[PDB]
Amino acid sequence: SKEIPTPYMWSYQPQMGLAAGAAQDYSTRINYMSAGPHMISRVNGIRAHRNRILLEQAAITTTPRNNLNPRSWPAALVYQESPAPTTVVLPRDAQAEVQMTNSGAQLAGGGRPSFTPRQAILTLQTSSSEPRSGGIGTLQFIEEFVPSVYFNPFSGPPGHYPDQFIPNFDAVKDSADGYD
Amino acid sequence: KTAVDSITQKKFLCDRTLWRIPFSSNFMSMGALTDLGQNLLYANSAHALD
Amino acid sequence: KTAVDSITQKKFLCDRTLWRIPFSSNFMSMGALTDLGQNLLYANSAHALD
Incomplete structure (x- = not known):
């Protein structure tokens, strides 16, 4: 229980984009309780081989951070859409059609004109003006927030205890939230 | 000078409107996404309402 | 229940106003010196109005 604990699995909140709070994996x-030492020892070696995988999965995949479950992820640590720039081939020459129309020709329908060899091409930035920060998506909640194997639980001075497992805890208040 | 003994009936009428009770910690509109909608009690858990 | 067979007459009255037709290419007021009033400086052509 202290040597081979049960991992705290994180609850996601799809709206805020943060983790709600971690409870232990009671449902897996x-x-x-009907086994003997020939099989209790074999299951406890599977509880411990799983906890070695989760520490190995967190060392590979989880971003190294001080506060577990932060409340505002920085823009450099959030996966952001960076598409290719949009290449726009502009259909019509603007000042070559105001000279055909002033000369008396009625243009209708639609190089693309037979009266203009000019072709304008515009390249536009597809991505946002500012990089997005504040909340991670579903796929980055999978990469981070690997279930926490918390060895020797709640034995270190309080304040070092993980309060960010609790779904009521504000980190920047250091208090559990209430109904108002 | 021959007035009768009377009692006062007070009431109000408030047409066309909705009795709004905002889900804010001070009942004020400080934003459309209120401070109790961002409250981690109401965000990270499921609660009954009666 | 004894209503007669009827026809509907529709009209409008619009007093106090001038029927403004703007000399713009989209009938909008994007400025006092309109884009068709600048197109005719660029064209340098005289036209007769009928």
């Missing part, structure tokens, strides 16, 4: 537990 395996029942060896």
Whole structure:
């Protein structure tokens, strides 16, 4: 329980884009209250081999950060859409059609004109004006927030205890939220 | 000078409108997304309402 | 229940106003010196109005 704990699995909130709070993986537990030492020892080696994978998965995939579940992810640490620039082939020459029309020709329908060899091409930035920060998506909640294997739980001075497992806890208030 | 003994009936009429009760911590409109809609009690958990 | 067979007459009255037709290419007021009033400086052509 302290040596081989149950991992705290994180609850996502798709609206705020943050983790709600982590509770232990109670719903994937395996029942060896009817097993003996030939099989309790084999299941406890699977509880511990899983916890080695989750520490290995967090060392590969989770972003190194001080506060677990921060409230505003920076724009450099959030996956952002960076598309290719949009290449716009402009259909009509503007000042070559105000000279045909002033000369008396009625243009209708629609190089693309037979009376103009000129062709304008415009290249526009597709991405946003400012990079987005504040909340991670679903796919970055999968990469980060690997379930926390919390060895020897709640034994270190308080304040070092993980309060960001709790779904009521504001980090910048250091208090649990209420109904008002 | 021959007035009768009377009692006062007070009431109001408020047509065309909705009795709004905002879900804000001070009942004020400080934004469309109120401070109790961003409250981590009401954001990270499911609560009954009666 | 004894209503007669009827026809509907529709009209309008619009007093106090001038029927403004703007000399713009989209009938909008994008400025006092309109884009068709600048097109005719660029064309340098005289036209007769009928």
